[PDB]
C-alpha cells in the first residue's frame, strides 16, 4: 500500500503485508481493522493529516500476475501522543528517548565532582572548550546581511534566546560525556539562597585523590 496526494501526484510506498490463503480455507473476516502506523511516510511527504491524501494499494498473488480488485481502506486513524495530557489522557509524565540525566549540583557526590572536573580538564587541556565558548563569545562570526558589520552569534534580544543556549549547554555536555564524564552537566539552583558559592566552582584548587 502507498499513499498518494492529488498534487504532483507523487507516491511513497508505506510498506506491505501478507494475508495467508488457500483453496479450501475456513470462511473468515476480521471484525477489526489491521493497523499499520504509516506515520513516518506521512511526515516525509510534508503532508499534514488534513490535506487530501487518498490511500492506494496494489495486490499480487504468489506468481507474478496482479490481482484485481479491492480493498476497503477508507479509514486512516490519527493517534495522539499519550503524553500531551489532552482530551483523552490523564496527566502522566511521558516516557521519552532520554539518555543523560542532569541533576542538582548540591546532590553531587565526592566522586561525581572529581569525575566532572577531570573530564572538563581534558576538554580544557585540549583546545576544545574555548572553541565552544567562541560560538557565544566576542570573536564575532556573524556578519549579515550584506554584511556591514559582524556581530556576536548568540541571540539575546530574541524570544529564541532559550533555544540558542539550550543548544549551547547541549553541545558542551555532548563533548563532555565523550571525554568520559560520569554525569551530564549539572544545574546549580541559585533560587535557593546561599552564603557561599558551590564546592565545584568556588575554590581555586581541589584535592585530587587519584594523583
Amino acid at each position: 500500500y502507498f499513499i498518494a496526494a492529488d498534487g504532483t501526484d507523487q507516491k511513497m510506498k508505506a510498506g506491505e503485508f501478507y494475508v495467508l490463503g488457500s483453496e479450501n480455507e475456513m470462511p473468515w473476516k476480521f471484525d477489526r481493522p489491521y493497523k499499520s502506523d504509516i506515520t513516518y511516510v506521512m511526515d516525509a511527504m510534508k503532508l499534514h493529516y488534513t490535506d487530501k491524501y487518498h490511500v492506494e494499494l496494489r495486490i499480487t498473488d504468489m506468481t507474478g500476475a496482479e490481482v484485481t480488485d479491492l480493498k476497503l481502506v477508507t479509514s486512516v486513524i490519527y493517534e495522539p501522543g499519550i503524553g500531551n495530557f489532552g482530551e483523552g489522557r490523564r496527566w502522566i509524565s511521558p516516557i521519552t528517548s532520554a539518555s543523560r540525566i542532569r541533576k542538582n549540583l548540591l546532590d553531587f557526590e565526592d566522586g561525581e565532582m572529581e569525575s566532572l572536573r577531570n573530564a572538563f580538564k581534558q576538554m580544557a587541556d585540549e583546545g576544545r572548550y574555548e572553541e565552544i565558548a567562541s560560538f557565544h563569545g566576542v570573536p564575532a562570526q556573524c556578519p549579515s546581511e550584506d554584511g556591514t558589520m559582524v556581530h556576536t552569534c548568540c541571540l539575546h534580544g530574541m524570544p529564541v534566546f532559550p533555544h540558542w543556549h539550550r543548544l549551547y549547554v547541549s553541545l558542551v555536555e555532548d563533548e563532555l560525556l565523550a571525554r568520559g564524564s560520569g554525569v551530564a552537566v549539572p544545574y546549580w539552583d541559585w533560587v535557593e539562597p546561599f552564603d557561599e558559592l558551590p564546592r565545584l566552582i568556588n575554590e581555586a584548587t581541589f584535592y585530587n585523590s587519584r594523583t
Binding site: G86, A98, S144, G157, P159, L167
Partner: protein, 182 residues
Amino acid sequence: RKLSYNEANCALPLMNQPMRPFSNSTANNDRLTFTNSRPNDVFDYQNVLHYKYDTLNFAGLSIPQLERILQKNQGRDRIFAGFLLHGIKASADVRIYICVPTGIGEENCGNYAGIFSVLGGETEMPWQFDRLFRYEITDELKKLGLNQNSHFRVEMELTAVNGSKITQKIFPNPTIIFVPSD
C-alpha cells in the same frame, strides 16, 4: 495547563531560521547540534538532545502543587512596574526606587524596591523587546502602606557594570500596572 509546550503560538517567523553559529558548517562540526539548529527542532529537549533533569519539580513542589501556588498568587491584588528594554552596547544594573510625594510642597523620592540586569557587549546584535518586562512592586508598596490609588511614581536608577559612569535615562519611564484579583 493544556497549552503549547513543544511549540510556540508566539513570534513565529523567528522559529525556522537555524541558529547562526550552529547552522554554519564551520566551525560547528558536531552533527547533533548542526541538524537541530533550527529553533523548532530544540523544543522537546529529551527526544532530540537526549537529556533529562532528575526532577522537574521546583522548590520541592510537584507541578500540580506549583500551579496551585501560582493560582493563589493570582488570587490577590497585585501591582507591577513595566520596563521597556532594548540593546545597549553594554551590560548594566538598573535598580528600582519608589518615589513618594511629600505633602507640601511636592517632593520625592528614594525607596529601594528592586533590581534587575540587562546584558550586553560592544558588538552585540541590536534588539528591542516588543513587550514590557514586569516587576512586582506590590509588597514594597504595602510596607509603605501605599495603594494603587495612592499617589506615587517609580524611578529607575541605572548603574552599569563599570561600577561607574552611572547611566542616564536610557529606558522609557517605568509603567505602573495594576492587576486586580480574580
